[PDB]
Amino acid sequence: AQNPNCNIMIFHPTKEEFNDFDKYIAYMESQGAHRAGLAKIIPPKEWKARETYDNISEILIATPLQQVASGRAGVFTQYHKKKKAMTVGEYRHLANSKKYQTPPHQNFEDLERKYWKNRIYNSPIYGADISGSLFDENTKQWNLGHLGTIQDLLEKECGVVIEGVNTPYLYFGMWKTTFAWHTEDMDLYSINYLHLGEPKTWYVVPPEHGQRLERLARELFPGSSRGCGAFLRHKVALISPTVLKENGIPFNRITQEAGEFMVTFPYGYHAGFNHGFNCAEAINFATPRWIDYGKMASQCSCGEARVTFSMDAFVRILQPERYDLWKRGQD
Numbered sequence: 001a002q003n004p005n006c007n008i009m010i011f012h013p014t015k016e017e018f019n020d021f022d023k024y025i026a027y028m029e030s031q032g033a034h035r036a037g038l039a040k041i042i043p044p045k046e047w048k049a050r051e052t053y054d055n056i057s058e059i060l061i062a063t064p065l066q067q068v069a070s071g072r073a074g075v076f077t078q079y080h081k082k083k084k085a086m087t088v089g090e091y092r093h094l095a096n097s098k099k100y101q102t103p104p105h106q107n108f109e110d111l112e113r114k115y116w117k118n119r120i121y122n123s124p125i126y127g128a129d130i131s132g133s134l135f136d137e138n139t140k141q142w143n144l145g146h147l148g149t150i151q152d153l154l155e156k157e158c159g160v161v162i163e164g165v166n167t168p169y170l171y172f173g174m175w176k177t178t179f180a181w182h183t184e185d186m187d188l189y190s191i192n193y194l195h196l197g198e199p200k201t202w203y204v205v206p207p208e209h210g211q212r213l214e215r216l217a218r219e220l221f222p223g224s225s226r227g228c229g230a231f232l233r234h235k236v237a238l239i240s241p242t243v244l245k246e247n248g249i250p251f252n253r254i255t256q257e258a259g260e261f262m263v264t265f266p267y268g269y270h271a272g273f274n275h276g277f278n279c280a281e282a283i284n285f286a287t288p289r290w291i292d293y294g295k296m297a298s299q300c301s302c303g304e305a306r307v308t309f310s311m312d313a314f315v316r317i318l319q320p321e322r323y324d325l326w327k328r329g330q331d
């Protein structure tokens, strides 16, 4: 069995290997990459996402979110407070302000220490889930707006034709902006490209060990767990690496820098934080190997998780028994 310790693998495809996206995912899996839950892909030196980032300041962040924490430094939740609209240029100036900018630090490890010590005492502002793309239309390789769609994958594998669409989303981050522990909707894959700016640190639990993380989370967030049998779908809970180590949870960590892709694999729990002002693009995708995970994915039906239109079909076709309850949670 390849990669039996479930380490995060880093790939360096050639320009020729960069042509066929599906083939390369399947290659990474042949080498055991999925066992980690996360892989990094460094694009060939000849590749670029677009020519420059000099003209992005007028993108609008219609609903910036202030991430307010509650709990203790290593075990906390966050809620998202809506803020007034602002442009990317206004958000960048805010991220760089004395109140929000990255502190002086020695290296990524020092900054990680500072994040986990001090995150809860601040409320950074995040642009999230902004439909759109920064890939040039002429970029043919690994263009996250030109991927094969999940609806087409389901039709190819299963024969069933369904409604829905699959488009990318932009994220604008600053120091301490945080992504809570989660798997993707319907335990899909994700791909994330860091277009510009400062790094993103990721933590990940191997898919084969995800239920260990879920059991710890039920222990650490006991009221949330009573409220919902899939409360990690709410995407609000944080647990530090120190707490995961104290509790014996298998995990790995890696830092993504600008110009790098990350792929998350089905049922790979992940969480992390941004180092400073940045812009990322991400989208969910499927392969044939996903189908079995989609059929088994947990679902939130308490009303909190509320998700896209296109997840309806996935539940309806893959999880007909759960469909009525889950749709009630949507309405």
Ligand SMILES: O=C(O)CNC(=O)C(=O)O
Residues within 6 Å of the ligand: 171, 179, 190, 191, 192, 264, 270, 280, 281, 282, 283
């Ligand atoms: O850009 C981001 O914060 C969030 N990304 C993820 O959790 C992902 O791509 O799967």
Ligand SMILES: [Mg+2]
Residues within 6 Å of the ligand: 055, 056, 057, 058, 059
């Ligand atoms: Mg612009």
Ligand code: NI
Residues within 6 Å of the ligand: 182, 183, 184, 190, 264, 270
């Ligand atoms: Ni994710």
Ligand SMILES: [Zn+2]
Residues within 6 Å of the ligand: 227, 228, 229, 230, 231, 233, 234, 300, 301, 302, 303, 304, 305
């Ligand atoms: Zn719920």
